[PDB]
Design an enzyme around this catalytic site. Structure first.
Site, PDB file in Angstrom:
ATOM      1  N   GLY A 171     -18.801 -17.634  23.485  1.00  0.00           N
ATOM      2  CA  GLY A 171     -18.192 -16.644  22.587  1.00  0.00           C
ATOM      3  C   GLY A 171     -18.310 -16.828  21.080  1.00  0.00           C
ATOM      4  O   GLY A 171     -18.960 -17.745  20.591  1.00  0.00           O
ATOM      5  N   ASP A 207      -9.467 -25.810  22.756  1.00  0.00           N
ATOM      6  CA  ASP A 207     -10.859 -26.068  23.092  1.00  0.00           C
ATOM      7  C   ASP A 207     -11.777 -24.964  22.545  1.00  0.00           C
ATOM      8  O   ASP A 207     -11.872 -23.911  23.139  1.00  0.00           O
ATOM      9  CB  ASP A 207     -11.034 -26.252  24.627  1.00  0.00           C
ATOM     10  CG  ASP A 207     -12.383 -26.884  24.994  1.00  0.00           C
ATOM     11  OD1 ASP A 207     -13.309 -26.991  24.151  1.00  0.00           O
ATOM     12  OD2 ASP A 207     -12.569 -27.192  26.160  1.00  0.00           O
TER      13      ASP A 207
HETATM   14  C1  LIG Z   1     -14.306 -27.444  33.470  1.00  0.00           C
HETATM   15  N1  LIG Z   1     -13.578 -27.525  32.164  1.00  0.00           N
HETATM   16  C2  LIG Z   1     -12.365 -28.406  32.204  1.00  0.00           C
HETATM   17  C3  LIG Z   1     -14.470 -27.653  30.962  1.00  0.00           C
HETATM   18  C4  LIG Z   1     -14.883 -26.296  30.356  1.00  0.00           C
HETATM   19  N2  LIG Z   1     -13.858 -25.249  30.133  1.00  0.00           N
HETATM   20  C5  LIG Z   1     -13.187 -25.349  28.827  1.00  0.00           C
HETATM   21  C6  LIG Z   1     -11.669 -25.297  28.941  1.00  0.00           C
HETATM   22  N3  LIG Z   1     -11.214 -23.905  28.954  1.00  0.00           N
HETATM   23  C7  LIG Z   1     -10.358 -23.335  28.063  1.00  0.00           C
HETATM   24  O1  LIG Z   1     -10.374 -22.133  27.940  1.00  0.00           O
HETATM   25  C8  LIG Z   1      -9.302 -23.997  27.240  1.00  0.00           C
HETATM   26  C9  LIG Z   1      -8.490 -25.024  27.684  1.00  0.00           C
HETATM   27  C10 LIG Z   1      -7.545 -25.411  26.745  1.00  0.00           C
HETATM   28  C11 LIG Z   1      -6.577 -26.565  26.930  1.00  0.00           C
HETATM   29  C12 LIG Z   1      -6.327 -27.366  25.639  1.00  0.00           C
HETATM   30  C13 LIG Z   1      -5.201 -25.947  27.109  1.00  0.00           C
HETATM   31  C14 LIG Z   1      -7.171 -27.626  27.838  1.00  0.00           C
HETATM   32  S1  LIG Z   1      -7.706 -24.452  25.345  1.00  0.00           S
HETATM   33  C15 LIG Z   1      -8.993 -23.477  25.949  1.00  0.00           C
HETATM   34  N4  LIG Z   1      -9.594 -22.470  25.261  1.00  0.00           N
HETATM   35  C16 LIG Z   1      -9.426 -22.165  23.953  1.00  0.00           C
HETATM   36  O2  LIG Z   1      -8.789 -23.059  23.208  1.00  0.00           O
HETATM   37  N5  LIG Z   1      -9.857 -21.035  23.429  1.00  0.00           N
HETATM   38  C17 LIG Z   1      -9.786 -20.585  22.126  1.00  0.00           C
HETATM   39  C18 LIG Z   1     -10.090 -21.409  21.035  1.00  0.00           C
HETATM   40  C19 LIG Z   1     -10.031 -20.979  19.706  1.00  0.00           C
HETATM   41  C20 LIG Z   1      -9.627 -19.668  19.410  1.00  0.00           C
HETATM   42  C21 LIG Z   1      -9.321 -18.819  20.473  1.00  0.00           C
HETATM   43 CL1  LIG Z   1      -8.772 -17.209  20.063  1.00  0.00          CL
HETATM   44  C22 LIG Z   1      -9.404 -19.289  21.787  1.00  0.00           C
HETATM   45 CL2  LIG Z   1      -8.978 -18.163  23.041  1.00  0.00          CL
HETATM   46  C23 LIG Z   1     -11.620 -23.045  30.072  1.00  0.00           C
HETATM   47  C24 LIG Z   1     -13.162 -22.829  30.115  1.00  0.00           C
HETATM   48  C25 LIG Z   1     -14.008 -23.994  30.664  1.00  0.00           C
HETATM   49  O3  LIG Z   1     -14.641 -23.851  31.714  1.00  0.00           O
END
Ligand SMILES: CN(C)CCN1CCN(C(=O)c2cc(C(C)(C)C)sc2NC(=O)Nc2cccc(Cl)c2Cl)CCC1=O
Ligand SMILES: CCCCCCCCO[C@@H]1O[C@H](CO)[C@@H](O)[C@H](O)[C@H]1O
Length: 332
Positions: A29, A161
Site C-alpha cells: 500500500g 507495522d
Molecule cells: C505474517 N505477519 C505476522 C507478517 C506480515 N503482516 C504484517 C502485520 N499486519 C498488520 O496489519 C499490522 C499488525 C500490527 C501490530 C503492531 C498490531 C502487530 S499493526 C499492522 N498494520 C499497520 O500498522 N498498518 C498501518 C500502518 C501505518 C498507517 C496505517 Cl493507516 C496503517 Cl493501517 C498484517 C499484515 C501481514 O501479513
C-alpha cells in the site's frame, strides 16, 4: 454514504471521502497524512496496493483488517475508520484504513535528541505495555524496530507495522527456525533499548551473515543447554567450529547506563528464546518502578484467528473482507 473524490499522489490514484483533506504522501500500500475535517485531527490513511491480486494478498488484506479492528490499546495502532468507494461487493477492489497521525517515528527522535535515562524508561515501558497487549491476543509482531514506532511530542508511543530491518531481528528469524515464540519481539526491544541508551545501532549488520556474527560477538556462541535443543543435526557442527566467543560482560559494554537498564538488557538479549523475559515480566522489572501500574496494563479480548489455517478462494477472502468493512463501528 459520504461523497468521494478522486486525487493523484505520486503516481497513485486515491478515492476518499471529502471529509478527508490535504492529502500528502508519507510513503509507498501507500500512506498519506490528511486532515480529518470531521473531527479536526490529523490522520494517516493507508490505501492497500492490489488487495485482491493473489490468494496470499487477499488473505493478508483480510488479516490486516481483522487485526486492526481488534487492536484497542493506547500503545498500539488503532482503527479510526475503514472505507471503500465501491457501493457493492462486485465493485469492491480497494481498501483504505484510517488511524491517528503521530507526527514522528522513533529513529527521528533518536538521531536528533540524546535521550535521558528517564526518557528510555518511559519509551521502553510503552513498547512493553503495547507488546503485553499484542502478545495476549496471540500475535507476534516479528518486525519490531524504531521506524515501526510512532511517537508524539509528549513522547507517547504506539506500536505499528508500516510493512535494515535486520538490525532488530531475532537471530532465530534469520535462521528460519520456524515456530518462534513471542520473545522474538523481546529480542527486538533489547536492540531498541540498547540504541536508546547509546545513541548507536547495537547490531549494524551489513548483511544477513554479518548480523549473526555481530550478535554472536556480544552474547557469545550458544551454550550447552541451547546446543541441546538444536534438533537439526545441521547447525551444531558448524557452530562448534566457530571462534568460541564468550558472552561479553554487559556492564562493561553499556558502561555508564543505569544498572537496572543493563540488567533488563541482559534479560532480553539472550540467545535462547526460552530464557528471555516476557513483556509481562518486563513491566514488573524494577527499571520501570516510576511507570509500572499493574491495574493499567490491560490485555486484549480473545482474538479469533482460525482464519489463518484456512485455504480459501480469492472471492471468499474478498467477501469476508467486505463484511468486515461493513461491520466496522468507530470508537468514541
Ligand atoms: C505474517 N505477519 C505476522 C507478517 C506480515 N503482516 C504484517 C502485520 N499486519 C498488520 O496489519 C499490522 C499488525 C500490527 C501490530 C503492531 C498490531 C502487530 S499493526 C499492522 N498494520 C499497520 O500498522 N498498518 C498501518 C500502518 C501505518 C498507517 C496505517 Cl493507516 C496503517 Cl493501517 C498484517 C499484515 C501481514 O501479513
Ligand atoms: C547463531 C545461533 C543463534 C540461534 C538462535 C537460537 C535461539 C532461539 O531460541 C530458540 O527458539 C525456538 C523458538 O523458535 C525454541 O523452539 C527453542 O527452544 C529456543 O531455544
Amino acid at each position: 454514504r459520504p461523497t468521494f473524490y478522486r486525487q493523484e499522489l505520486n503516481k497513485t490514484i486515491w478515492e476518499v471521502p471529502e471529509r478527508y483533506q490535504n492529502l500528502s504522501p508519507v510513503g509507498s500500500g501507500s500512506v498519506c497524512a490528511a486532515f480529518d475535517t470531521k473531527t479536526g485531527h490529523r490522520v494517516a490513511v493507508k490505501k492497500l496496493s492490489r488487495p485482491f491480486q493473489s490468494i496470499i494478498h487477499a488473505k493478508r488484506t483480510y488479516r490486516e483488517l481483522r487485526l486492526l479492528k481488534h487492536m484497542k490499546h493506547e500503545n498500539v495502532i488503532g482503527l479510526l475508520d475503514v472505507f471503500t468507494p465501491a457501493r457493492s461487493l462486485e465493485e469492491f477492489n480497494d481498501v483504505y484504513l484510517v488511524t491517528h497521525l503521530m507526527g514522528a517515528d522513533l529513529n527521528n527522535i533518536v538521531k536528533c535528541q540524546k535521550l535521558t535515562d528517564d526518557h528510555v524508561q518511559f519509551l521502553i515501558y510503552q513498547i512493553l505495555r503495547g507488546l503485553k497487549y499484542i502478545h495476549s491476543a496471540d500475535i507476534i509482531h516479528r518486525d519490531l524496530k524504531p521506524s515501526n514506532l510512532a511517537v508524539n511530542e509528549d513522547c507517547e508511543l504506539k506500536i505499528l507495522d508500516f510493512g535494515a530491518t535486520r538490525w532488530y531481528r531475532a537471530p532465530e528469524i534469520m535462521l528460519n527456525w520456524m515456530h518462534y515464540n513471542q520473545t522474538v519481539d523481546i529480542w527486538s526491544v533489547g536492540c531498541i533499548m540498547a540504541e536508546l541508551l547509546t545513541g548507536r545501532t547495537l547490531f549494524p549488520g551489513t548483511d544477513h551473515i554479518d548480523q549473526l556474527k555481530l550478535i554472536l560477538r556480544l552474547v557469545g556462541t550458544p551454550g550447552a543447554e541451547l546446543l541441546k535443543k538444536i534438533s537439526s543435526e545441521s547447525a551444531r557442527n558448524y557452530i562448534q567450529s566457530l571462534a568460541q566467543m564468550p558472552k561479553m560482560n554487559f556492564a562493561n559494554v553499556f558502561i555508564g547506563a543505569n544498572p537496572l537498564a543493563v540488567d533488563l538488557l541482559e534479560k532480553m538479549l539472550v540467545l535462547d528464546s526460552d530464557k528471555r523475559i516476557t513483556a509481562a515480566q518486563a513491566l514488573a522489572h524494577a527499571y520501570f518502578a516510576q511507570y509500572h501500574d499493574p491495574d493499567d496494563e490491560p490485555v486484549a479480548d480473545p482474538y479469533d484467528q482460525s482464519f489463518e489455517s484456512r485455504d480459501l478462494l480469492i472471492d471468499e477472502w474478498k467477501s469476508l473482507t467486505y463484511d468486515e468493512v461493513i461491520s466496522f463501528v468507530p470508537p468514541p
